[PDB]
Design a protein around this ligand. Structure first.
Ligand SMILES: CCc1cc(COc2cc(C(=O)Nc3c(Cl)cncc3Cl)ccc2OC)on1
Ligand SMILES: CCc1cc(COc2cc(C(=O)Nc3c(Cl)cncc3Cl)ccc2OC)on1
Ligand SMILES: [Zn+2]
Ligand SMILES: [Zn+2]
Ligand SMILES: [Zn+2]
Ligand SMILES: [Zn+2]
Lengths: 322, 321
């Protein structure tokens, strides 16, 4: 009831995702995905049985770790809802097909599933079986994908059962391309290519973005989901601070884990040598703002208020460095 | 008698155009084991790396056992041949004293495991059928990722860890080079590999000089890549055998495709085949553009390899009706 009222803001940047998580009984990924699928009419279009969709969403969400402070179901829910908003941006109206929309949203939902709360390097340096399976290359991101797809095989979980072989192949390719691009090691080349697109940006008669080949289409989708993944600092300050607390909590636990084991502590993971505020400022300056400024140019002027909030939020963290 | 003829055949171990098919029959289908062991002795790798001999043999036999006997081309003879060809490419004068013993071990081990557990079908067939392997690897270099994982997993079998006396540092560095090398054996990576090698031939520093790890690995990746694509550069009676073997494997995949109502892959249709035209195309578009560029890097070391290639191409041409 109060849930239904929070869920009207689903098309809005700055949805109260933590409140939705409390009111859904820790089912933000399920309720938010279901709402977006109903709103986009994705069950009708792709003939998804509603019970199959809910069983799958529940299974997926169950495979995010409740012990993990940042890379859990709430963050998945947030990235999903953020991608949903970015997909609705005026400059992208009627640009992407239903299957392309479904891919970006499915990709967002599965994109951190079964995340252990430690980095790829931690997994590589411990010689984990996961690093062994994936030859030390995008270990986590390959795992998120294989889990997200594998869950379709559980009882009544195949939400794609009515898609044709061509649709399934197309969808699967797009999902893999998007999630593999969520590895930060790919950040600089994604951004470089977004920049190049902005430099040679074309618009149709209808005033929306022209993307006429797979390469450019997937590039934008990768950058969109990447933007959603890195959208925390662009959110209302009250939301951004809760995300900040959770990432640091998760980073510190990795640091305590590395310390116990006599490993080099990873950057930002030392709870005894932390500058949370200084780190948020550098994060915005070197990563978040460069990316969002380029996105904003791509979809000008749709994202202007997102960028203004970003810039407000950085100044707050600056004001609060000791 | 039969043990003596093997020994005299392995004397050509340092030569291009070893009689690898003879060695396969003479060792009782143990070409990878006998050729790897010979090369490890020839290079003093058992001493340098303090690999116990029983451990080496046990691992080599284990690895060899995980190549498929029923697979016409991507079996243990192919692996023995890539191993031996890499060994010969490593001994080229232009590259003398360039690579460390670990880098040598990396390239040889990578050659050895580069196709282990190959099912005889392409990545695409595995993708299209929704196989477990393609699901695990997200349709991305499915087989090559697998080859690596199997090669490394086999070290964990009883008395198989041939890197047990390597230090933590050596293990970390070897592992990273093997991964880099085998992953470049995916043909989807051929164009960027060639281009990158073309760039290095141009900004060539000289006995070749290699500054960073980017340049060191790039050469090793391309060397193993050349070893992998060396069949047409071999004495004709060997090349003819390799062509017969790849066409048998391709036609078998075609038969499986035809069977399943799938689109038959290029060169896999035995009812619409041009073995001779395809070989000339293979040389012109892939093998010769790469061997020409390797020959340019090691000038003049690969003249005879490149002459054999140009001779074999003209032979296959003559055979076109
Ligand atoms: C370079 C300075 C710097 C500072 C931080 C810490 O800040 C944050 C970092 C991240 C963050 O890095 N998330 C993340 C992504 Cl998008 C992809 N792969 C792995 C990870 Cl951990 C998500 C949210 C944050 O604050 C609310 O990360 N880098
Ligand atoms: C372009 C025409 C063309 C013709 C062929 C057939 O010829 C051959 C092809 C191959 C061959 O393609 N080997 C291969 C490599 Cl190096 C890497 N990944 C997968 C594979 Cl199957 C190995 C040996 C051959 O005969 C000497 O392949 N492409
Ligand atoms: Zn991630
Ligand atoms: Zn994420
Ligand atoms: Zn291969
Ligand atoms: Zn091969």
């Amino acid at each position: 009831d109060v849930l239904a009222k929070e869920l009207e803001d689903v098309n809005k940047w700055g949805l109260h995702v933590f409140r939705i998580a409390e009111l859904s009984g820790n089912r933000p990924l399920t309720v938010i995905m279901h709402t977006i699928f109903q709103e986009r009419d994705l069950l009708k279009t792709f003939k998804i049985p509603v019970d199959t969709l809910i069983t799958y969403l529940m299974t997926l969400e169950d495979h995010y770790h409740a012990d993990v402070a940042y890379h859990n179901n709430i963050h998945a829910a947030d990235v999903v809802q953020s991608t949903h908003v970015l997909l609705s941006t005026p400059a992208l109206e009627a640009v992407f097909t239903d299957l392309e929309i479904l891919a970006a949203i499915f990709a967002s939902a599965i994109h951190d599933v079964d995340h252990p709360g430690v980095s790829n390097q931690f997994l590589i340096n411990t010689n984990s079986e996961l690093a062994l399976m994936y030859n030390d290359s995008s270990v986590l991101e390959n795992h998120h994908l294989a889990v997200g797809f594998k869950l379709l095989q559980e009882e009544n979980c195949d939400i794609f059962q009515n898609l044709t072989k061509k649709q399934r192949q197309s969808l699967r390719k797009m999902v893999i391309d998007i999630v593999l691009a969520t590895d930060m090691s790919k950040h600089m080349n994604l951004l470089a290519d977004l920049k190049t697109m902005v430099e040679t940006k074309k618009v149709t008669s209808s005033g929306v973005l022209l993307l006429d080949n797979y390469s450019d289409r997937i590039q934008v989708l990768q950058n969109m989901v990447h933007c959603a993944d890195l959208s925390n600092p662009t959110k209302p300050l009250q939301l951004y601070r809760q995300w900040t607390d959770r990432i640091m909590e998760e980073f510190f636990r990795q640091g305590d884990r590395e310390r116990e084991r006599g490993m080099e502590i990873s950057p930002m993971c030392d709870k005894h040598n932390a500058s949370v505020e200084k780190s948020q400022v550098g994060f915005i300056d070197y990563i978040v703002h460069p990316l969002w400024e380029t996105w904003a140019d791509l979809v000008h002027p749709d994202a202007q208020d997102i960028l203004d909030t970003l810039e407000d939020n950085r100044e707050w963290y600056q004001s609060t460095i000791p």
